[PDB]
Design a protein around this ligand. Sequence first.
Ligand SMILES: [Co+2]
Length: 193
Amino acid sequence: KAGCPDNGMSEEARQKFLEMHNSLRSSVALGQAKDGAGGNAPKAAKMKTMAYDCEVEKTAMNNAKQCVFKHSQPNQRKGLGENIFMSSDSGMDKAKAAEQASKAWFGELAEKGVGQNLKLTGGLFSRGVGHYTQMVWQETVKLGCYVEACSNMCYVVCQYGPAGNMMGKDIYEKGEPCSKCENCDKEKGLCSA
Ligand SMILES: [Co+2]
């Protein structure tokens, strides 16, 4: 979602990825997101707005173009986190793929649960909610994704800068929406720079 190269990724898909990420981060920040562990995820005091980044898309593309479903190694995406997703519908619309990937990742919260302790402990890290926690990582403010049509799958990779899912760190700071940032609408809960 914007000024990126004509590289096979659709603008519609870029826009959908960013829109979904910010919308879902907002829902969490406002205390509106159901948590499988009980109640809703806690409100966030300074959930940051994401922007789309063409350079992050470039390293996401390096993974997706391989048409093998797997996480890239850290040095193949220096300083970035990563979520991956696949569908058997190889030729599906890329915007539709963006929506499905974003929902599947976010769904870990409702389905597996996270709870009110947002410190990324070894326990939490091992419960398989790492796609969700990366989507709502407070300090992650750059998003870049690529969707590749492969022989047997539609393969989706998003990368995230700076990387989230840092062990021992909080996913986000708890508090009333906007309570710890200036450029923020109390009814949205997202902080801009
Ligand atoms: Co993963």
